[PDB]
Amino acid sequence: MEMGQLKNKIENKKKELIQLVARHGLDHDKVLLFSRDLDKLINKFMNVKDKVHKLEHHHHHH
Amino acid sequence: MEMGQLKNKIENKKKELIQLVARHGLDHDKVLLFSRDLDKLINKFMNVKDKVHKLEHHHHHH
């Protein structure tokens, strides 16, 4: 059944959704930001568990 | 004009996607995490995070 096809359906459905969030009232920059952030969240769960988050402020904010 | 029906579509589509990301290998806890954090991301960009700003944890939390 191929996970590549599964991923393709994910892409499609995610994109169908992006269109919905977009038509809500997002401008293209918002759509770009949303879609890419959305994509990383998906990739996080789908494959890459990118936990290497750079913390600039550590413990104390100032 | 009704954004309730629009949101109804967003929710449904979001969940259509979630069910696809989920069936890929995500466990039950994974689905729960993904769905709630995805919801949050959408609300963020929609700016529709309800007409209040509920303190939940640091600021909000879902």
Side-chain angles (χ1 to χ4, degrees), chain A residues 3 6 9-10 13-14 16-17 20-21 23-24 26 30 33-34 37-38 41-42 45-46, chain B residues 3 6 9-10 13 16-17 20-21 23-24 26 30 33-34 37-38 41-42 45-46 48:
Chain A
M3 295 184 299
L6 184 283
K9 299 302 180 62
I10 292 182
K13 209 58 53 185
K14 171 188 69 184
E16 289 179 61
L17 167 281
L20 297 176
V21 190
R23 63 180 296 172
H24 176 270
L26 295 185
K30 294 301 178 301
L33 296 172
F34 175 72
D37 196 300
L38 164 58
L41 175 59
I42 293 180
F45 284 75
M46 287 287 294
Chain B
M3 293 180 176
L6 182 283
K9 296 183 175 302
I10 294 181
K13 191 62 60 183
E16 292 186 271
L17 171 80
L20 298 177
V21 188
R23 64 183 59 179
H24 176 75
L26 275 59
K30 291 276 177 177
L33 295 171
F34 179 74
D37 213 78
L38 169 55
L41 181 61
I42 299 180
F45 280 81
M46 303 184 64
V48 184

